[PDB]
Amino acid sequence: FDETEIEDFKEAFTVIDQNADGIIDKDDLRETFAAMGRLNVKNEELDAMIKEASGPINFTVFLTMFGEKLKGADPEDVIMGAFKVLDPDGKGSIKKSFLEELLTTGGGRFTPEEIKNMWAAFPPDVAGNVDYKNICYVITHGEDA
Amino acid sequence: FDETEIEDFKEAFTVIDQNADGIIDKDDLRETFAAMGRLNVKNEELDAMIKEASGPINFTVFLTMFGEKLKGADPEDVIMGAFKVLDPDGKGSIKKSFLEELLTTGGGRFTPEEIKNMWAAFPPDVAGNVDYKNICYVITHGEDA
Amino acid sequence: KLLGGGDVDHTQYAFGHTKVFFKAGLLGLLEEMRDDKLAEIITATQARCRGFLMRVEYRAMVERRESIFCIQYNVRSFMNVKHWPWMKLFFKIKPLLK
Amino acid sequence: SKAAADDFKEAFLLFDRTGDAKITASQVGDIARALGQNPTNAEINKILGNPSKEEMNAAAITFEEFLPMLQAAANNKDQGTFEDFVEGLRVFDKEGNGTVMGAELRHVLATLGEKMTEEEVEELMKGQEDSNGCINYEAFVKHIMSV
Amino acid sequence: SKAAADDFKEAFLLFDRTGDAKITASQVGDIARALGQNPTNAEINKILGNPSKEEMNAAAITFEEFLPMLQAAANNKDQGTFEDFVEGLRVFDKEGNGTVMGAELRHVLATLGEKMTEEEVEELMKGQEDSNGCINYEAFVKHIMSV
Question: Minimal Cα–Cα distance from C79 to chain A, Å?
Answer without folding.
Answer: 9
